[PDB]
Design a protein around this ligand. Sequence first.
Ligand code: FMN
Ligand code: FMN
Ligand code: 8CM
Ligand code: 8CM
Lengths: 360, 360
Amino acid sequence: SALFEPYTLKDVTLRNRIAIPPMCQYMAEDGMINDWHHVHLAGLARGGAGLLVVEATAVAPEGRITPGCAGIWSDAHAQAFVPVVQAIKAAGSVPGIQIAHAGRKASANRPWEGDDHIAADDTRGWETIAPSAIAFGAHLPKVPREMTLDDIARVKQDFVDAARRARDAGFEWIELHFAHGFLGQSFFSEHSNKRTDAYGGSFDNRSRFLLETLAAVREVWPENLPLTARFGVLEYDGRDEQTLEESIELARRFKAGGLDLLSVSVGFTIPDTNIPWGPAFMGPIAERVRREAKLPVTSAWGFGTPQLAEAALQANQLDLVSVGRAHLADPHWAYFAAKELGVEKASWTLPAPYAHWLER
Amino acid sequence: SALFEPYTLKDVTLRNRIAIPPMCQYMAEDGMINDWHHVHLAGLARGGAGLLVVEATAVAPEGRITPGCAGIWSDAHAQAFVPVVQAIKAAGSVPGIQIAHAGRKASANRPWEGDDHIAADDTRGWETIAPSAIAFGAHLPKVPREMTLDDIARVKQDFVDAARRARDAGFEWIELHFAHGFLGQSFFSEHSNKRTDAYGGSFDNRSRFLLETLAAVREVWPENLPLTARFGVLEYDGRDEQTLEESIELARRFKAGGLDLLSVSVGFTIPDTNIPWGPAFMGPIAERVRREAKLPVTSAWGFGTPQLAEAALQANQLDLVSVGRAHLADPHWAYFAAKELGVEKASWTLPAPYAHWLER
Ligand SMILES: Cc1cc2nc3c(=O)[nH]c(=O)nc-3n(C[C@H](O)[C@H](O)[C@H](O)COP(=O)(O)O)c2cc1C
Ligand SMILES: Cc1cc2nc3c(=O)[nH]c(=O)nc-3n(C[C@H](O)[C@H](O)[C@H](O)COP(=O)(O)O)c2cc1C
Ligand SMILES: O=c1ccc2cccc(O)c2o1
Ligand SMILES: O=c1ccc2cccc(O)c2o1
């Protein structure tokens, strides 16, 4: 099975091609993770996936999506990850982390607590920052503050510090969250970036925050560990061919700047779009990026059907298959997939105290 | 759905009728549990089951099955359970524990490391104790030492101390392991008990260790928390009707002595038997015990098919359905069962960070 072939990137070898993508839990307190996360992550690692990427972890308090988001904006926040990293490694999975800044989509309620911007007089909320003072709209009506050049320098340094902390906590894989309408994506998109300084206008200027942040992170992140990013390569906003062309060009610059793998997604920059949701719908776009930028990729959305994961890999659409919600439903999805695909000794996807009893 | 109706016993209310029965993990060191158990148990509790019974936990070192078994023979061993109990409670499941003594089946290898008695010159092994100096046979050839009356008093006191420790660690449900050919079962069975003192011969004498141990435990175990036992009610050894009749009589004495629920199993006392394994094969025998002893029961073996669990409950064969291996395969089996049975808002079997995203 292609799904169960190992994958090596830099000095890291994943035992199979199943990646658990970042999935926010909304269970942290002032950014500090706790036994929610410890058990959640260790349990997933034991389920058999080759790579487990920790949820969007804010580089700065105001870059959380919600009051429940994880953070890594101090050394104490970083040290809270150490036992979880060690548990993921003990289970034979590779520990990764997505470092993030929510930009104009920050200061929102948890998804089951309204999913919308926090009211102005709620003591939990905060001012958001972005390239330009323009609201997302819809359920995120708050107008962000336009960043100064010093704010740009500060946020870049927060990404650097976050990466240094992730490294020292023992993570073996990092993902910069440049997707999903958050700060990085919003610098790239003309919808959200109306700046007239070095950080907006042209393609080079809109790319600049992302490329400078990648380069700054690269100074502290070990060359022998995968350096990755998530990036929305189109919006489904009626501008798809031009946007894809620019996104592919940016992917080439990321590769030239040391990016080892790209997690290909949708922008979610603005609400007025028509995204054609369906099982593995991103496969063809991920394949195009992979081919035209000559860079390994992953993608997500509906790959929890094992045969579809297998087909994407065999078609060379993807190098890793990211499987999210199916792992919330069943932490042992990798074992289910092994059985479904007829892998020999499928139960030994799991550790011995499970595998022995589930043989045949 | 019957499976998702709450159950109250003494002061304890289970949110549904799904019990996770004790399942040895073989991951402890000198009886001390560790992060294997913490994550395993907390993850199961979050999966939705109403009751989670911790694996056979030895009341004394020599009563472990294997070198990897959990123990509760000192206060330090008990305190290791406290964070796990607290995590099970935080998830809304009821924490239980099975306290045990393996008798002649002790000093064995882990199941994936030979499953047989440990060699005499292996530094990990130890002398086993039992009612009579008679080996199980087959892969467990070691002849145990015949217990003295002082040994009987000591082991009873070890059960008492174990129960007191379980209580003080915060367990809300206790199960005495009088099944599966271990010490208690072996005192009851004429196959293994050839004693000619007060603890063997007659029905009353063979029952005596079990009844005295129950009574001694009852002195320290709170009356407001369920006091339960697992007991093998037949062997499939050609003596089934007579053995069932005696086992039912013992169940009546257990009830009269304060037992709140019986986990009905098979004896496994000797190897030369013909057990008719099949899905829910114990249902009719559990029903007979329930009816003839007028005592709540659970049973196990093949109830991981949700419709079969539901049928057993609706037939009043069982009060709780114990689902073991299906929970090793999928820690979130209760959610799977809720979906399969068409329960409203099935994803809310799980906590919010999962349930929200799995709705519909
Ligand atoms: C609970 C939940 C939280 C998510 N949090 C993040 C996140 O932290 N960062 C991110 O890039 N994507 C996030 N996503 C998107 C997932 O990584 C994934 O791309 C998406 O769920 C589609 O894959 P699936 O169909 O296998 O679930 C999240 C999705 C879910 C369901
Ligand atoms: C891994 C494993 C360990 C077990 N350990 C115990 C135990 O500690 N005590 C016990 O009474 N039964 C033990 N059993 C038996 C289970 O509680 C249960 O009765 C049995 O697995 C049948 O249910 P199932 O078909 O749902 O797995 C164990 C079974 C398994 C699979
Ligand atoms: O696509 C998604 C869905 C949910 C989500 C949640 C947090 C962060 C993200 O980046 C997300 O992306
Ligand atoms: O039926 C079983 C199967 C496995 C097992 C393991 C340990 C203890 C027990 O009591 C057991 O019972």
